[PDB]
Structure formats: C-alpha cells, structure tokens
Amino acid sequence: LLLQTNLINYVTSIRPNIFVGRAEGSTQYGKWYFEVMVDEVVPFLTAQATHLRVGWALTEGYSPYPGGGEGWGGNGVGDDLYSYGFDGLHLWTGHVARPVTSPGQHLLAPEDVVSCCLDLSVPSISFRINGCPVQGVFEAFNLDGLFFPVVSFSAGVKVRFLLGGRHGEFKFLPPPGYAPCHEAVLPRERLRLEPIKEYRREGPRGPHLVGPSRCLSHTDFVPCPVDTVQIVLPPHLERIREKLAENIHELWALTRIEQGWTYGPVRDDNKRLHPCLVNFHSLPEPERNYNLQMSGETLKTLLALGCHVGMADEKAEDNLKKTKLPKTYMMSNGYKPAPLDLSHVRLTPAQTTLVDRLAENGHNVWARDRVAQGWSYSAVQDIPARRNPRLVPYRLLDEATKRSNRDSLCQAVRTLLGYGYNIEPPDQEPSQVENQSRWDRVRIFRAEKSYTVQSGRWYFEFEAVTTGEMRVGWARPELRPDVELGADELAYVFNGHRGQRWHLGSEPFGRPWQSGDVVGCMIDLTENTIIFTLNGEVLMSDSGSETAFREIEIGDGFLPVCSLGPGQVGHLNLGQDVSSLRFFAICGLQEGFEPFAINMQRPVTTWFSKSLPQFEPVPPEHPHYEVARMDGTVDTPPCLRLAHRTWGSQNSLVEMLFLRLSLPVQFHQHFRCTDNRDDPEIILNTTTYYYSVRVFAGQEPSCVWVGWVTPDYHQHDMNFDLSKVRAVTVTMGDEQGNVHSSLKCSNCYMVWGGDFVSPGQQGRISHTDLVIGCLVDLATGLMTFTANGKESNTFFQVEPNTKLFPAVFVLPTHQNVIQFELGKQKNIMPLSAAMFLSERKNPAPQCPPRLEVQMLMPVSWSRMPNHFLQVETRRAGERLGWAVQCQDPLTMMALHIPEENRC
Amino acid sequence: HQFGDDVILDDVQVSCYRTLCSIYSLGTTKNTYVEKLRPALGECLARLAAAMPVAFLEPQLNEYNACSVYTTKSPRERAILGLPNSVEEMCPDIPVLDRLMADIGGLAESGARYTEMPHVIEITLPMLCSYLPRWWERGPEAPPPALPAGAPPPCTAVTSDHLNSLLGNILRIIVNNLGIDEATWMKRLAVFAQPIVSRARPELLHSHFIPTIGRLRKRAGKVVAEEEQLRLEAKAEAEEGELLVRDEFSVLCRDLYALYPLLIRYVDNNRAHWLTEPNANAEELFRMVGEIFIYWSKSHNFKREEQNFVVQNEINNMSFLTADSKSKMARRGDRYSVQTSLIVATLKKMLPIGLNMCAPTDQDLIMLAKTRYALKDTDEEVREFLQNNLHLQGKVEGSPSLRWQMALYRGLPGREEDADDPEKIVRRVQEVSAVLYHLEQTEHPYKSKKAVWHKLLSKQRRRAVV
C-alpha cells in the first residue's frame, strides 16, 4: 500500500556499433559470435551488489534510462523483453532471473570469458562460460529489429569486448557457421563502443543535450529494386541494348587496363585481372549474358520510371562518332574496341539524378541476385563462403563504389544519347517516410518548475552544434511533452533551421543558424517582451520589430526550454558561471538582463520528454474519450464504459487505444501441486476469478483485443496485432539434451475478437454485442477465455507471483466501444476479491474508486539526473580488443510503486 | 538571385556593355535634361554593375573569367558579330578601377563640390558601390573552398581596402558639401554606400566619423544658441529669423540623414568589439550622439524639420534599419515615427557604450542625476550635486548582483578601479543621466492622450461648418 524507498546504484549499457537481423531478402548473415572478458570486478563497492550482464539486445525497445525504471531500477540486459542476458548464474529476460547450470558456477569474476552466440534462424541465443557450455537458451523471440551486443554494468567493472579479427582475439574457437561480429562492421562506419539512446553527452565547455538517434531497420538491408515485369520493348530497343551491353563490357575492360589489370590464363581475386580481356567476342559468353540481363534491366527501369524515350535524330543514329584509342598505348590483344566519344554528349542535372537512381536500382538488383544465390554481407570477403563486402544496398554502400556505379551508368546514358535516343525524366514526387513518429523523434528539455520566474529580465544561451531542427525559447510550467514546441499557447520559441518563430503556429523570423552559432534568449516580464539574438546580433522579423513576441501574459510563469530533433546536438547555458556566456556582454548586460542561474549554488535541474509509453488515468476532460462508471443492477454487474465524444464529427480522432485497469491481480507464490445459484463451499474455496468485456454493436470485434498485460507493457503501436506481442522462451536442459524446462514469457496475453466472430465477410454488421470473458486461476496460473459462453481454444500459463492487469486494445469504429464488466460467473469470484484483501471472500462484485481506466500515453516528463556515470571506452589493442571501464559509484534514492512494480 | 552568370553570357553581355558605356559617355555633357535624368541612369548602372558577370573595370584579368564572351566564343566566332578583339577596346571611355579611385580621392582631398563632380556622385559612385562588393566576394579574401581556391586565379583584385578608401572619400565629399542649401544627392549616395560599410576598418572611425559628428554637433549647438537668443528676445522680428533657424535645422537634418544611416551599420559591426575592449573614440562618439539627441529633445523646431525632411523626401528608413534582413534574405508609422528617427536609433545603438563607461556602482548616482534633470538642474549643477553626493556610491558587499557585475567590470581590460577618479565618475554619470532622462521623455512623450481626438466633435462640427 505505501510507497517504498531504497538506495540503488546506477546502471549503464554499452554496445558496439554492430547491428544484425533477419529479413526476407536480407543481405545479412544469420549466425554471429562475440566474447567478453572480465578484467576487474568489485562485488560490493556499495551496499547494493555490483551489476554485470552480457547479452544481445534489440534496437527497437531497448531504451534503458538512468535511474528510474521497472522494478527497483538498475535496468540492464534481461530487464525487458527486448534484451537477453547472462550474469554468470542466471539468464535474464523480462526482469526475471532464471538459474542456469554451468560447471563451476559463480557470479562473473575476473579472468572469466563469456562467449555469446546468436542464430537468427531458430531463433536462438546461447552462452559458453570459459569455453564451457551454459545449459540454457533463449529462443522463439521476436525478430522485429536488429540485434547488437551489449554489456550492462554498475560501477566497479572493467571488461573487454572481443569481436574477432583485428578487433579482439577469441580465447575460444567460435562454433561452426558463426561469424565474428566485426564482420558486420559497415562500410560507411568504423567500429566503436557507444551508449544506447543517450539524451546527454559531456562536452568541452559543458554537457551537450542530444536528440533521438536515427537507427537502421532490418528491412533497410533488404534491397527493393523497382519492378520490371510489365515491359514493352520497341525492336530498336532490343538490339541497342545488346550494343550497350558489349559497349559497357569493353569500356570496363579498358578501364581495368588503364588501372593496370592485365591478361591472365586463369583468374584470381587478389591478382586483380580478368580473362575476358582479349577481345569483345573472345571474352566469355557468361560475362556477355550477365551484361545483357543488366543492360535490359536498364531499359526496363527507365520504362518503370516512365521517362519518355524517343529517337531524336536519325542522322546521329545512323552515324556514330568513334573514339580512337591512343596509338601510343599498346595492349597484349593488339586490337581495341572503340566506344563512342563521351565529350560531345552533354548531360543535365536531371539526367544526373536519374543516373544516380538507376545505379541504385542496378546495384540493388545485383544484391538481390546474389542473395537468391545465397550470398551474404561481410566486411571481409570470402568467395568460397559467399560473403561479400559490397553486398549491401546502395544507400549503405560506400562512396567509392557509389562513384564507380555512377560513372559507369552516366557513360551508359551518354552512349544512349550518342545513339540519339532522347530521354525526358518524369516529374519528381515528394514522399514522407514517417518511419518514426514525432513523439519519439522530438525530445524537450526544460527547467524544473521550481525555477519558474514570474518577474524580472532574464537571459540564457543555447549553442547549436548541429544546424538541424532545434527550437529554443521560454515555456510555461504546464508544457505538454506531446506537442511540438510552439504549436500551442504553452511555448514561445524560435526555430533556426528555417528561421521561424513559434507561438500558436509558425511565422518567419530571424535567420537560420550555422554550426557553432549561439542563440541568446531574453525575457522581459516588466515590459512583457521576448528577444532573440544570434551570435550577439538581435534577430528581426519581416518588419522593424526587435521583439519576436509581445504583450505576453505573465500568468503562472515561464521556464527555459529547448527541443532537439533526431541527430541534433545543443548546449544549454543558464548562467551559473557568468564567464562561460559568450555573447551576454555584447547584448543583455547593459540592457540589464540577468542570467537565469546567476546566483545558484547548484546547476539548474532539468526535465526531459521520455518516449517510454506509460499508463495514466483517462483525463476527465479528454476531448475524444469518455469513461462512465455504471452502478451494478440485479440484471447487470458494475461496469466501466468507454465512449467517443467526437465520433462522426470533423476533427474526430480515430487511433489505437490501449486501456488497462489500475489495479492488478497477483498469482499465488506457490502453485497447488498437480438456477445459477453458487455453491458456498466451492465459491469460497475457489481460486478462479472472472471479468468480461462487452464490445458494442457497431464496434468491429476485429478491431478489438481483450486480455491481460503485465506492468512492463510499454508498446504503443498504431498497427497493432498479436504478432507484435513480445514473447520469448527460456529452455533449460541437461548437459546432454534432456530439456528440463521450457518457460514462455510475454508481457501481453490477449485474444482477438475476429477469432470469436462468426465469419461476416457477408453481412459484416452485427446487431448483437460481443461479450468476451476472461478467467484466471491464481493457484494453477492458468488463463482461459469464453466467446459468448463458448470456451475458446486459447489458453495461457504463467509463473507464480505474476501481476496481471485487465486490458483492452481497441480501434474505435462507433461512439460506444466497450465496457469492462466486473461480474462473476457461477462459482467464480469477481476481480474485486482478487484485487482487494478485505473482499477476498466476498463474491459480491464491486468497483471501488481506486479501480479506474488507464490509457497509454507515449511520452512523459522525466527528471534528468544531476550526475551521470563516467564510462571510459578505448581500444586496448588489436588482440586485447575494446575496453569498457567504470570505477566511480553513483546511487539514487528510489521510490517504488508496488502495484505497478516501477520506480 | 545571383542569376547574372547564367543569364548575361554572350549577346546579353554585348548589350550590357553597350548600355554601360553609353550611360558613362553621357557624363561629359551638361544639360537640364541630363541633370534631371542622371539618378535613374545611375541606379540602372549600379544594378547592371552588380548583375554583370564580367569585370569591365578590371579587363586585363578577364582571361581568367569563364563567364565572358571572349572565353566562351572562339575567335572564328566574334568575327561574325563585330568586336574590337579586346575586352579593353569593348569601350575604352570607362577608366580602370585604380584610375577611378584615384580620381575620386583627388576630388575629395581637393574639396570639390557637387557642381565640379556631378557625374561622379550621380553615376560613377553607385556603380563602384555595386561593383566592389560583388567582386570582393569572388576575389581574394573570399572564403575559399580548397579545390576552387586551387585552380583558377581570381579575375578581380578587389579587397576591403578599396571599399574602405571609397567610404572615406564619400564621407570626405559629404563633409565638403554639408553647408550647401541644396544637396539632394546625399540620400542617394548614402543608400548606395550602405553595403560597403560592412568591410570598413576600425581606423575609419577616428579618421573620418569623429570629426564629421563633431562638426555637426558644433553646428547644432550654434543653431540652438541662436534659437535661445531668439526666444529671449520677443518681437515681430523675432518671428523673423524663425525661417533662418528652420532652414538651418533642415539642412542639418539632411546632413544627419546622410551621415548616420552609414554609421549605424559601422556601429552594429563594431559595437561588440567596442564593448569587449572599451574604446575612447567610441565613448566620444557616444558623447556626440548624446549631445545631438539632447539638442533634438530640447528644440521643438528641430524635430519638426526632421519630420518635414522625412515626409517630403519619402525617406522610409526601414531599409536603413532592417537592410540586413534583405542581405540575409529571409501607414503613418511607416511614414514618420519617433522610433524611425535616425537620431534616436543611433543613440540607442551607441548607448551600451555609455552604460559600459559607467560602473555598476554609479547607478544610484545616475538616478539622482536623473531626478535633478527632472528638477531641470543644469549640467554644472548636476556635476556639483554629484560632487556632494559622491560618497553615496553603491555598496558591492551590500548588494549581491553588484558583486558579479563589478567582477565583470574588472574583467574588462580597459576598466580598472584605480584609474577611476571622482571627476571622471561625476562626468560619465552626468552624461548617462542626461541621455537616459531625455530618452525617457522621448520614449513616453505623453503627447498622445494629452488631448485625445476621437474627432466625434470634429464630425459633429463638419455638419456645423456645412
């Protein structure tokens, strides 16, 4: 009942920049191996035990934030369903430690080597300790994102990542078919050790606020060349295509010659020479065939783009100016095939962009063909193993190969123009990927409300390390994290990406900054004005105004605020050290503005928008959603009903709604071994509890999911379906197979209403109201469902001590959507008995005030720790590998909400 | 929109040369038609010089320029269309840049008036003001990227020294021609000269501006003395001489609206450095502008003549204030407002220098001097009052903010507590107090709302005059 307090150490996670995943058509190898060696561990630097876990983590959803988190904090590997870890004695997943058997069991200690193996195919994660198998595996886990190695630690740790090759040397041989993680290193990127989803990093003058990182997706590695199935080829486009096939083949051969390639009776990679060199016929046919298919893919791609191609000039088509190879040069062949001159042909910028797009498509086609053959990506090339460094889509491709494929294709286009075929590109059409929502993309950092000022003249500085989307200004204490800064009345901000000023919308103002520029924000409450300066010069509107905003109402007060987009870096100075300010003397000092923190012994406390979705009570005044508490009747039980206020109206909001009841049901610690009038002894001694959800007519059951959620559920998906549900199976077995145990753990347990509905592709609308009943036996840990009094096939089994909240996920299709009906089937207790101790033996249904509906809100305000762990990352050596060190403890007093199991 | 390189390439260049050289050739002759016509020709000439990709003034270095007919066209071409075969022979009448700059100098040091060099002022100088910036951007001292820097030699030789010398010579011409009754070219020359001030060197201040503003301040003072004597003596003859003092006011306001709109920019670029390292010349400039503002505030007529000048000459002043917005590139108030007044704008721009002169401690004495000015106490009277109340100076230990303010005050290199003396303190307090005083009356004149005009009575009395 009462909030609990305890001291907890801070935990931080470090990963290499290796990201591996599985997708259809992907360029990525499935099997991966890495090692971690423990140099130093301090078991008890503080009262709390030292933290050290090694494992694999998923890019999407592994967002360990310092301090507060699930349980009592210390979020690391295995504290979420996204992460899988090994502590030496246990396997961690979903904040649950499951003991695993290894020879000489001990918590990770110095001179210990952990070998981690990932097989995306099964999928499985396995561990070896000091070359000895660990008798447990993670399997059947979600593949929604990429996987990266990770170590989670508290202070008192020194460890080394061994990733193979030049980046670390493996103490133990990788199991067959498992690639070292260093092979995954991408062309455009160099190996490094980085924090995960940081909002802060130390800087020279001071800390830098950091926006959300831009992370790749497992789909990105899949090439997606444009379709060429629907093609109509003019006859002259048929032969011309072969003409360019041979022309590009000859040009490439000569080019290799100028770079110095020679003729070889046999061919080899390192050698750098190709046997085709000898004549444009004498070269092998398979090279001709390969060049022919791609030459056709060129024309088919032009057609797919829809650019208009036509024979412009019969004279140039009939007569082709022939470049003459220099007589001075001499070649073993003795005869050179003369290509068309490139000098006389001219290309426009639009043709250049077309060339870039066509080169992209050609490389992606090549990658798809190699993938079909079974080739995969590897920074190190092994032809026998079918691993190539260039087997990556064009965007991720390096600049050198990009340029080679460019140049080749632009000369191909000039060849087409030399034949005279004029090509006219179609108009470009903009597209917005929306790969990530504004919610997660934008972070807002504001001063704490305690520092709110209702008077005076204040100055503070914001340095823009990046030139991209960032906003700086003054905000009201009740600023909502969800809204972009300045869209509403709550914020008075300036955006120098575009040179705009925002309050209740955007207006042009000032000039855009450049890297290193400093924005001085001043607020004068006496004159009720706000002033912006850039590098010491006042910004001006599309007018003579020296003030961005005027006639401001003091109201509750104002606070300094900034917002960073993805890949954006700012520096916020509030004037605790007046000397640090660069441009204060130039503007503001003589005007009399005082720094926001001029006289403060401590740095100003900041709060940031955190994208972790959490459940909050439905607001009474929420414009779109209304929750009605209905009293129980003789015919009906107590109910909580959801209604859409604005349905069937312009501005109506239709989007996924994740709802849960405030109070959980807790399963027993120890599971038991092995008329409609209730029987008293049965009902009193029963451990079975029931609730129901009524989906109203007009609300499509296909849009409704019913069941339970664990407190760790944090997944806010617009395109929700049961497949998105996190799940993982922990399997423990003997040294020789003989699996002892298999445990399936998930945060969400639900049933789709489309399963229950009788098929209605015909006559879909049903006047009847669906009623899905959820039953849980606390003693046996069993969960079952009923459609309309008909037992459903779905069932779940949970471990003891599990907390489960009644939950409904719904997409509204009608003004009346659902009711949580809190009632009892014959010989089953209602949820009130399980929830409340006093009512444990009362079969009478009740809905007390504490029980309330809670809706998922994606973003929330979270305090920023005053001090952060200092982590030293380096490369100790080629053989030693990379090194991570933490030595200085940090502790935080943590307040724990028992029902929500969060801190 | 920087279209010139692409647009004016071969035949457009030929036509632009012909127009350029015709307009320049027009200079020699004197006629009433020519005199009324020149300003439009000079404006067109300046725009053409800005747009034209070739450096006609610097032809010997044309071979480097790609955006030229000579480089684009083969010698076989250019025989079909008649050419001299040399960009120098284009049109020789236009002199080279060095020659023209030397001529403008010689005139300025000679003291030539508008009558001697009317062609220069109306036509040539705007062309140079447009030419020098554009070619400075493409010339040495441009921010070079590595590859473009290493390969082509810049065609232009323009440097910031050219712009600084031109600006100094223009100011010299204006000081030569201040007194004259009719100087309409002043506004046009100032508008054309605004761009080059950005590259003005610091020495220009002491060399040119301080003497100019000092002379204008002296003239203002003489004029106010005449006005005071005229108010002292009351006659119909006293109504006579009102005309003389207003004509003096109008010509003086013309000189100011010529000189300041250039200075404001010079101040904006150099204000940061003046504040970082205090400069005696900047302090003296503040004193001059403050004295002029005091004269403006005290003299009723001076304000009205400023206003008449602005309205008759249709001077917007928005370009002078906001032109940086134009460079960076994204109505009665617009007609005349006190905010628009260049006097108050310049005083507000230079005020931080005056404030920096006064130490944070001196704020209390400044307020006392302001109260004395409200008692209408004279300059010497406030000086002696400050002498009496010097002990009142604020207490650093007593006040927390004054602590860090004064810490910064020492942090300034020029400002040391030992250097300060009672006379210096009382003087700077007096100056800042007078400026702040008169600025407070200017900012809240109370002329509005003193006699509100809903003109309901005026409407009711229109029917009565009917």
mmCIF file of N, CA and C in Angstrom, chain A residues 511 534-538 540 546 586-587, chain B residues 194 197-198 200 205 209 260-275 285 319-325 345-353:
data_model
loop_
_atom_site.group_PDB
_atom_site.id
_atom_site.type_symbol
_atom_site.label_atom_id
_atom_site.label_comp_id
_atom_site.label_asym_id
_atom_site.label_seq_id
_atom_site.Cartn_x
_atom_site.Cartn_y
_atom_site.Cartn_z
ATOM 1 N N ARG A 511 17.090 34.725 -38.880
ATOM 2 C CA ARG A 511 17.856 33.993 -39.871
ATOM 3 C C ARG A 511 18.246 32.632 -39.316
ATOM 4 N N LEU A 534 21.278 36.245 -32.163
ATOM 5 C CA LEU A 534 22.093 35.193 -32.756
ATOM 6 C C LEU A 534 23.527 35.687 -32.866
ATOM 7 N N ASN A 535 24.436 35.021 -32.155
ATOM 8 C CA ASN A 535 25.852 35.378 -32.164
ATOM 9 C C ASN A 535 26.043 36.855 -31.825
ATOM 10 N N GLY A 536 25.214 37.358 -30.913
ATOM 11 C CA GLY A 536 25.324 38.718 -30.433
ATOM 12 C C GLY A 536 24.573 39.760 -31.231
ATOM 13 N N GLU A 537 23.808 39.363 -32.245
ATOM 14 C CA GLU A 537 23.027 40.288 -33.054
ATOM 15 C C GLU A 537 21.548 39.955 -32.912
ATOM 16 N N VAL A 538 20.738 40.979 -32.647
ATOM 17 C CA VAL A 538 19.310 40.773 -32.437
ATOM 18 C C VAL A 538 18.663 40.321 -33.737
ATOM 19 N N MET A 540 15.528 39.968 -36.280
ATOM 20 C CA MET A 540 14.433 40.848 -36.656
ATOM 21 C C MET A 540 13.426 40.087 -37.503
ATOM 22 N N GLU A 546 12.098 44.543 -33.065
ATOM 23 C CA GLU A 546 13.197 43.920 -32.344
ATOM 24 C C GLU A 546 12.720 42.829 -31.395
ATOM 25 N N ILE A 586 27.829 41.511 -24.960
ATOM 26 C CA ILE A 586 27.509 42.217 -26.196
ATOM 27 C C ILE A 586 26.052 42.657 -26.196
ATOM 28 N N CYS A 587 25.147 41.769 -25.788
ATOM 29 C CA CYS A 587 23.728 42.083 -25.696
ATOM 30 C C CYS A 587 23.159 41.468 -24.428
ATOM 31 N N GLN B 194 25.623 52.199 -48.335
ATOM 32 C CA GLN B 194 25.388 51.306 -47.200
ATOM 33 C C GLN B 194 26.144 49.986 -47.303
ATOM 34 N N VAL B 197 30.030 49.590 -46.089
ATOM 35 C CA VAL B 197 30.441 49.916 -44.727
ATOM 36 C C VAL B 197 30.761 48.654 -43.938
ATOM 37 N N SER B 198 30.179 47.517 -44.327
ATOM 38 C CA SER B 198 30.418 46.277 -43.597
ATOM 39 C C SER B 198 31.906 45.963 -43.514
ATOM 40 N N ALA B 200 34.319 48.218 -43.621
ATOM 41 C CA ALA B 200 35.079 49.366 -43.147
ATOM 42 C C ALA B 200 36.002 48.965 -42.003
ATOM 43 N N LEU B 205 36.792 55.195 -38.157
ATOM 44 C CA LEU B 205 36.080 55.939 -37.123
ATOM 45 C C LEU B 205 36.830 57.212 -36.764
ATOM 46 N N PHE B 209 34.801 59.760 -39.024
ATOM 47 C CA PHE B 209 33.486 59.929 -38.414
ATOM 48 C C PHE B 209 33.527 60.929 -37.267
ATOM 49 N N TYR B 260 24.465 59.507 -40.580
ATOM 50 C CA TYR B 260 24.155 58.421 -39.654
ATOM 51 C C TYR B 260 23.776 57.116 -40.339
ATOM 52 N N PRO B 261 22.898 57.082 -41.343
ATOM 53 C CA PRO B 261 22.470 55.770 -41.855
ATOM 54 C C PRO B 261 23.641 54.893 -42.266
ATOM 55 N N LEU B 262 24.778 55.499 -42.613
ATOM 56 C CA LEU B 262 26.007 54.729 -42.789
ATOM 57 C C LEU B 262 26.597 54.316 -41.446
ATOM 58 N N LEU B 263 26.607 55.236 -40.478
ATOM 59 C CA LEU B 263 27.272 54.982 -39.203
ATOM 60 C C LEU B 263 26.603 53.850 -38.437
ATOM 61 N N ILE B 264 25.273 53.798 -38.478
ATOM 62 C CA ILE B 264 24.528 52.781 -37.744
ATOM 63 C C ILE B 264 25.074 51.396 -38.057
ATOM 64 N N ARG B 265 25.363 51.139 -39.331
ATOM 65 C CA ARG B 265 25.936 49.857 -39.724
ATOM 66 C C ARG B 265 27.346 49.702 -39.179
ATOM 67 N N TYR B 266 28.163 50.745 -39.321
ATOM 68 C CA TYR B 266 29.508 50.716 -38.760
ATOM 69 C C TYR B 266 29.465 50.408 -37.273
ATOM 70 N N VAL B 267 28.473 50.957 -36.572
ATOM 71 C CA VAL B 267 28.332 50.698 -35.144
ATOM 72 C C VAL B 267 27.949 49.245 -34.901
ATOM 73 N N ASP B 268 26.983 48.735 -35.670
ATOM 74 C CA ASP B 268 26.485 47.384 -35.435
ATOM 75 C C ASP B 268 27.608 46.361 -35.512
ATOM 76 N N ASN B 269 28.475 46.480 -36.518
ATOM 77 C CA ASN B 269 29.558 45.518 -36.676
ATOM 78 C C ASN B 269 30.614 45.686 -35.589
ATOM 79 N N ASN B 270 30.885 46.924 -35.182
ATOM 80 C CA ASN B 270 31.967 47.224 -34.256
ATOM 81 C C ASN B 270 31.505 47.394 -32.814
ATOM 82 N N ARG B 271 30.195 47.346 -32.559
ATOM 83 C CA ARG B 271 29.705 47.520 -31.194
ATOM 84 C C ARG B 271 30.212 46.413 -30.281
ATOM 85 N N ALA B 272 30.232 45.175 -30.777
ATOM 86 C CA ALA B 272 30.684 44.062 -29.953
ATOM 87 C C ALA B 272 32.127 44.256 -29.513
ATOM 88 N N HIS B 273 32.997 44.661 -30.436
ATOM 89 C CA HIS B 273 34.398 44.872 -30.091
ATOM 90 C C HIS B 273 34.562 46.071 -29.169
ATOM 91 N N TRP B 274 33.791 47.136 -29.407
ATOM 92 C CA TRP B 274 33.879 48.298 -28.530
ATOM 93 C C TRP B 274 33.488 47.932 -27.104
ATOM 94 N N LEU B 275 32.464 47.090 -26.950
ATOM 95 C CA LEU B 275 32.055 46.671 -25.615
ATOM 96 C C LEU B 275 33.076 45.724 -24.995
ATOM 97 N N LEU B 285 32.225 59.238 -29.475
ATOM 98 C CA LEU B 285 31.111 59.185 -30.416
ATOM 99 C C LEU B 285 29.783 59.125 -29.675
ATOM 100 N N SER B 319 14.655 50.561 -44.707
ATOM 101 C CA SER B 319 15.804 49.932 -45.342
ATOM 102 C C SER B 319 17.060 50.163 -44.519
ATOM 103 N N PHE B 320 17.254 51.382 -44.016
ATOM 104 C CA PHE B 320 18.428 51.651 -43.196
ATOM 105 C C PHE B 320 18.436 50.774 -41.950
ATOM 106 N N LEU B 321 17.278 50.615 -41.302
ATOM 107 C CA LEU B 321 17.234 49.835 -40.065
ATOM 108 C C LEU B 321 17.357 48.332 -40.324
ATOM 109 N N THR B 322 16.647 47.811 -41.325
ATOM 110 C CA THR B 322 16.415 46.379 -41.478
ATOM 111 C C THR B 322 17.167 45.749 -42.644
ATOM 112 N N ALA B 323 18.007 46.501 -43.356
ATOM 113 C CA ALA B 323 18.544 46.001 -44.620
ATOM 114 C C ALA B 323 19.280 44.681 -44.455
ATOM 115 N N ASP B 324 19.830 44.428 -43.268
ATOM 116 C CA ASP B 324 20.485 43.151 -43.033
ATOM 117 C C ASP B 324 19.528 41.991 -43.263
ATOM 118 N N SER B 325 18.239 42.201 -42.988
ATOM 119 C CA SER B 325 17.250 41.181 -43.312
ATOM 120 C C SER B 325 17.195 40.951 -44.813
ATOM 121 N N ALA B 345 17.599 56.265 -33.032
ATOM 122 C CA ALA B 345 18.108 54.936 -33.356
ATOM 123 C C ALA B 345 19.611 54.848 -33.104
ATOM 124 N N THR B 346 20.367 55.839 -33.580
ATOM 125 C CA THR B 346 21.810 55.848 -33.376
ATOM 126 C C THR B 346 22.153 55.991 -31.900
ATOM 127 N N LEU B 347 21.413 56.836 -31.178
ATOM 128 C CA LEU B 347 21.679 56.987 -29.754
ATOM 129 C C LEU B 347 21.449 55.680 -29.013
ATOM 130 N N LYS B 348 20.378 54.964 -29.353
ATOM 131 C CA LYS B 348 20.112 53.686 -28.706
ATOM 132 C C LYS B 348 21.178 52.663 -29.074
ATOM 133 N N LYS B 349 21.670 52.719 -30.311
ATOM 134 C CA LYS B 349 22.721 51.799 -30.730
ATOM 135 C C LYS B 349 24.011 52.047 -29.959
ATOM 136 N N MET B 350 24.354 53.313 -29.728
ATOM 137 C CA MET B 350 25.592 53.671 -29.043
ATOM 138 C C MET B 350 25.444 53.757 -27.530
ATOM 139 N N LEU B 351 24.225 53.656 -27.010
ATOM 140 C CA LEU B 351 24.027 53.757 -25.568
ATOM 141 C C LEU B 351 24.787 52.703 -24.779
ATOM 142 N N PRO B 352 24.851 51.438 -25.204
ATOM 143 C CA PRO B 352 25.609 50.455 -24.412
ATOM 144 C C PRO B 352 27.036 50.887 -24.143
ATOM 145 N N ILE B 353 27.648 51.646 -25.054
ATOM 146 C CA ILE B 353 28.987 52.165 -24.799
ATOM 147 C C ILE B 353 28.962 53.105 -23.603
#
